[PDB]
Amino acid sequence: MRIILLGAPGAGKGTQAQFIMAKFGIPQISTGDMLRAAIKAGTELGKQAKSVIDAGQLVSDDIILGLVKERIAQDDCAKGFLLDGFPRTIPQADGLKEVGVVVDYVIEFDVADSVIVERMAGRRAHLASGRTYHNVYNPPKVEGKDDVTGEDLVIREDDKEETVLARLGVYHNQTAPLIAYYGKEAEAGNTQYLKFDGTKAVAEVSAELEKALA
Ligand SMILES: Nc1ncnc2c1ncn2[C@@H]1O[C@H](COP(=O)(O)OP(=O)(O)O)[C@@H](O)[C@H]1O
Ligand SMILES: Nc1ncnc2c1ncn2[C@@H]1O[C@H](COP(=O)(O)O)[C@@H](O)[C@H]1O
Numbered sequence: 001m002r003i004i005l006l007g008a009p010g011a012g013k014g015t016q017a018q019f020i021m022a023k024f025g026i027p028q029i030s031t032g033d034m035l036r037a038a039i040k041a042g043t044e045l046g047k048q049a050k051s052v053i054d055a056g057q058l059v060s061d062d063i064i065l066g067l068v069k070e071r072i073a074q075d076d077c078a079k080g081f082l083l084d085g086f087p088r089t090i091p092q093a094d095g096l097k098e099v100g101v102v103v104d105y106v107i108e109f110d111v112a113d114s115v116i117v118e119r120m121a122g123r124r125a126h127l128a129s130g131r132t133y134h135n136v137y138n139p140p141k142v143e144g145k146d147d148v149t150g151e152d153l154v155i156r157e158d159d160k161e162e163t164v165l166a167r168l169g170v171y172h173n174q175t176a177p178l179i180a181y182y183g184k185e186a187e188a189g190n191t192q193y194l195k196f197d198g199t200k201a202v203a204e205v206s207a208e209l210e211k212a213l214a
Helices: 013-024 031-041 044-055 061-072 090-098 113-120 161-175 177-187 202-212
Strands: 002-006 028-030 081-084 105-110 123-126 131-134 192-197
Touching (some): 013 028, 013 105, 013 202, 031 044, 177 192
16 A cells, blocks of 8 residues: 655644554655654754755755655565655656656645644644644643653744745645646546545544545
8 A cells, every 4th residue: 555645734644644554554654754863863964954944945856765765665665655745846756656656545635824824833743753743733642742652742943933934835836736746647547646625623634534545
């Protein structure tokens, strides 16, 4: 089972990825989490990516495609995977198509900018796993701490008000065309395309996903 999640930053992709991961027993491949891992390790890649991420801009397609290539070649990805925040640009999608990576579902979570701007304010994240929470819409069971590991949650630097506006502009320019791109792939019979109203409550979005998959 191979799945791509599309939608604005903050649309709820990582949240629904958790549900999907547990339903299909596939690993999540999140380029954002891989980059944050490199930052934590203090690599040259990490140092360079940190300023790009903090500016709300996209990391180079070439660096991204190589991280993803290495990742999906691992054994845990042999029976499938969920791509989360990848692809992010048309060249990334082409890079994936060119190496013949075929996917089963492309799932779009459609959420307006005004809703995203609202949401980012209460996002809290567990950096090591990429699990995210919302202090209003989806809180941790224990405030300030990850439900799984007990480790501290953080406010993301790129979740700042002004950076969020930057990211939404980057999204509408560079990443939204993936909706067309995969709509076309689905029209060619290369994948199934699903679109959901991502402004519904978390449990409501998950319930619709459950009904639509299988
Ligand atoms: N359906 C939803 N309604 C309200 N808030 C949500 C919903 N889905 C996720 N959230 C919250 O909104 C923020 C963004 O969700 P997240 O899954 O991290 O977005 P993405 O992975 O698309 O960037 C998080 O704080 C998350 O807890
Ligand atoms: N596929 C990608 N292509 C380019 N940059 C990315 C990609 N995934 C993550 N990033 C960078 O990491 C940041 C956080 O991504 P995310 O965790 O997916 O919201 C983005 O705003 C980009 O700066």
